[PDB]
Amino acid sequence: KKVKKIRKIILKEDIPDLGKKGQLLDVRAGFLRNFLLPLGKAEVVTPLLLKEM
Amino acid sequence: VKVILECTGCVRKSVNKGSRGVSRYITQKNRHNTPSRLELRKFCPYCYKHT
RNA sequence: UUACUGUUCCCUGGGAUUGGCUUUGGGCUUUUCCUGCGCAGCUUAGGUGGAAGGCGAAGAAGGCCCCCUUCCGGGGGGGCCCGAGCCAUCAGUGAGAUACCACUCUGGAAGAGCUAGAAUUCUAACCUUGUGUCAGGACCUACGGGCCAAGGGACAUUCUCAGGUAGACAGUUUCUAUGGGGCGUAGGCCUCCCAAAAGGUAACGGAGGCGUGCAAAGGUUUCCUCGGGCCGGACGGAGAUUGGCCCUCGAGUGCAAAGGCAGAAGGGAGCUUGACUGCAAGACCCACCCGUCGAGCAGGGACGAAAGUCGGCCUUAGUGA
RNA sequence: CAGUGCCGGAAGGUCAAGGAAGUUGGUGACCUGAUGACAGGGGAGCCGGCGACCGAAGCCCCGGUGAACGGCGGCCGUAACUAUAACGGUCCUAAGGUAGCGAAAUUCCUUGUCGGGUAAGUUCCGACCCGCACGAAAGGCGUAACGAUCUGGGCACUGUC
RNA sequence: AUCCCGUGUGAAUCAGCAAGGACCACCUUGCAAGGCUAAAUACUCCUGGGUGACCGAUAGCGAAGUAGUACCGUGAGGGA
RNA sequence: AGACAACCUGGCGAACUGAAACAUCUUAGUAGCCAGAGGAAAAGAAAGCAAAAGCGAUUCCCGUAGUAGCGGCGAGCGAA
Numbered sequence: 001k002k003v004k005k006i007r008k009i010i011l012k013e014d015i016p017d018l019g020k021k022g023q024l025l026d027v028r029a030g031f032l033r034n035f036l037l038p039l040g041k042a043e044v045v046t047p048l049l050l051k052e053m
Numbered sequence: 054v055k056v057i058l059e060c061t062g063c064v065r066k067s068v069n070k071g072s073r074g075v076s077r078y079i080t081q082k083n084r085h086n087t088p089s090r091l092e093l094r095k096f097c098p099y100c101y102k103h104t
Numbered sequence: 105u106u107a108c109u110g111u112u113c114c115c116u117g118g119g120a121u122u123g124g125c126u127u128u129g130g131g132c133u134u135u136u137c138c139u140g141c142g143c144a145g146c147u148u149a150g151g152u153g154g155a156a157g158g159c160g161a162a163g164a165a166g167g168c169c170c171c172c173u174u175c176c177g178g179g180g181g182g183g184c185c186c187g188a189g190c191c192a193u194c195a196g197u198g199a200g201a202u203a204c205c206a207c208u209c210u211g212g213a214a215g216a217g218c219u220a221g222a223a224u225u226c227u228a229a230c231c232u233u234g235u236g237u238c239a240g241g242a243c244c245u246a247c248g249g250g251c252c253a254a255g256g257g258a259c260a261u262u263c264u265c266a267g268g269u270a271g272a273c274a275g276u277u278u279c280u281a282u283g284g285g286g287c288g289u290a291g292g293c294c295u296c297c298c299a300a301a302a303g304g305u306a307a308c309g310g311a312g313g314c315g316u317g318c319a320a321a322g323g324u325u326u327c328c329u330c331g332g333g334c335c336g337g338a339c340g341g342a343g344a345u346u347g348g349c350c351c352u353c354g355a356g357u358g359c360a361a362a363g364g365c366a367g368a369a370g371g372g373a374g375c376u377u378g379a380c381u382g383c384a385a386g387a388c389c390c391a392c393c394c395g396u397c398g399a400g401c402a403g404g405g406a407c408g409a410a411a412g413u414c415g416g417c418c419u420u421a422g423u424g425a
Numbered sequence: 426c427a428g429u430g431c432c433g434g435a436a437g438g439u440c441a442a443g444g445a446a447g448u449u450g451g452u453g454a455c456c457u458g459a460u461g462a463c464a465g466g467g468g469a470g471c472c473g474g475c476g477a478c479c480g481a482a483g484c485c486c487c488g489g490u491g492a493a494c495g496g497c498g499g500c501c502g503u504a505a506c507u508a509u510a511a512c513g514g515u516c517c518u519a520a521g522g523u524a525g526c527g528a529a530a531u532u533c534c535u536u537g538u539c540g541g542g543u544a545a546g547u548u549c550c551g552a553c554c555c556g557c558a559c560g561a562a563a564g565g566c567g568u569a570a571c572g573a574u575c576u577g578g579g580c581a582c583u584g585u586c
Numbered sequence: 587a588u589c590c591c592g593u594g595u596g597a598a599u600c601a602g603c604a605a606g607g608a609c610c611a612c613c614u615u616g617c618a619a620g621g622c623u624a625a626a627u628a629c630u631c632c633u634g635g636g637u638g639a640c641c642g643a644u645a646g647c648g649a650a651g652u653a654g655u656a657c658c659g660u661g662a663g664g665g666a
Numbered sequence: 667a668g669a670c671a672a673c674c675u676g677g678c679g680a681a682c683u684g685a686a687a688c689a690u691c692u693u694a695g696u697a698g699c700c701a702g703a704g705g706a707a708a709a710g711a712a713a714g715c716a717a718a719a720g721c722g723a724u725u726c727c728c729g730u731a732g733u734a735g736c737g738g739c740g741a742g743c744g745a746a
Contacts (some may be wrong), residue, residue, distance in 0.1 A: 001118055001443050002595055017124075030123050034229040055317080079319095079379075087319060090406090093381040097404055 007032055009042035010050065054083045060102045062094050071095055077102065 007029035011019050018025050024045065036042035043049075059076040066072075075094045092099040 002120095004120085004122090004595085028123065030121090030229075034123060035227085038228080077380085081317090081319065081379095084319075089319075089377055089379090091377075091380065093404055097381090099404085 004029065008045035009036060010045050011042050013039075013041045055080060056082060058082055059104065060089065060091055061104050062099060062102050065096075069095070075102075 006026050008024070008026045009032055011021050011023055014020050015023075032042060032044075057078065057080050060079050061074065061076045064074050072095045077091050079089070086104065088101045088103045090100045091102040094102075
């Protein structure tokens, strides 16, 4: 019926699958909620933090 | 079987004096198709009113 | 209660809670091909365009061979060999080259995207447990809270939507005349009697049918008379078809009865579509609703030579606001 | 093991919500006809209609299961006198009642017929089976003991008479 | 159609968005997803004045004295 | 904090009844129950009506009007 969107993440730690600490490979919102955001492992791409830093 | 069915003329959607399709109630047709000469259509003389 | 409409428990699917890896793998694509028996023919005419030039020796015709759809008719290249051609308007031909390609087709592949479904697992969501550990003035081996551990695990749980589904539960209905009942019958329309010579008239009084059918069994013009007894004619008889007399309406009319109808309203033949449109003075019936008949007018016709007749049927039933 | 219930099964058919190729409609910048008082066609955008195909359980289907629901038949004929049916054929079902019981808390006819008990017994007991309309866990047939149970008879006993 | 919610998807800022009864085009009107406000307004367990073609002890409040009292009910409550 | 007759707001929310039965509908978002709060409460300052003419927050009364409608187009319901 419907598909849920994909949320952007910017890394802070080496993914054992795809990304080494700095890539912008966007995966899933639930993979950010349950796994990446509590473990200090990814962040949300915001223009206030990415563009000026 | 005695199917009820409508006879109809030739359509001619035009802007004449009330020109429109004319269908008439008729019965008995469980046979070959019978166009009868029912008339006084919107065009006043008419023949071979089909179906 | 297998009456109606539902509800609930429960089950089952789409969403959400809901994520990670790889396989099996159905539909779309990311480029190229093997690929096509209407014709006379070097040839199994892939619908179009670029068309005197390409493949070539970074090694072409023709001989050694693996493979396949197959109408085994005919083809493709992997290896080796061979050593300077395959032509190109040719005449056939709506449309042409197996010199060449941008496209792309009935069939599939190469490595890749996208989406199913199903399966494998991991833990981080979520669920369960812990007389495992820590905690305050003290305990929580008293529910519980933090931490840790184990078992599951994107399943289960919860929510919405959708299908199914239990009188478990809820609201209801379950006719009347009658014999004031199981056991029956009928409910509406038409014909005769009862019905007492206008019309009407009841009873679960006496008898029957109807819920249609006909492109003619409607319309018009025209012609004709059936029905029964007797007599004649090796099929053929009591009785078929034919001839003649007698009785003259007893026959017939799509079907029940009544009233009608004999040169007919009964039977046949020709032409036919009035089994139209817009109507309509006045009547009958009349609780209302309804229902029935109708002179006459206009248009456009059918038959007939005309006169005239025709707004369905000899009429009354064949129906529903 | 037919119908119903319950269980199991997956091949197929039917199949909701929803997804979706495609098709179609309205409006519409713009282009055309127009002795009419207007009209025809239509890009994109927006709003819709139908919808091939996918789409689970249920249901149809298949197989099992009577201490699951329940049901367990008619028709006649023939054996050395009268009989009666061991036996036979036929129709229809899913199958046609097995042991035991049987005028019974079940029998309408019926106070069936016989025997016992009684002077006399529509009540009682023992039999036959013509079981209107017994019957095997809605169990069937029995029995010791028991019952303010029902019912038949007898002794003693008495105003019940 | 307007308005508000349940599940799920999910915009634009004024060159816009919403409404004008499906919807589209033009025009008109207004600026949601932030809050607060007196008056006119409805009523009487009452209070203070004025009335009554309202009652006069079976009436008027149930109740003109102990009146929600005696009495009844376990109680809710009923009730002179 | 608790109490408060009625009005008011918010939530749960019927059924007898009417339809000459009854299920859509009505009775009815009424009664009742709970919560809250004031002498009033709610609402209230246009993402509003209207129609090419115009008005300017909310509330209440007369009217339109028993009109337009809605409805087993029944019983009834009824604006702006």
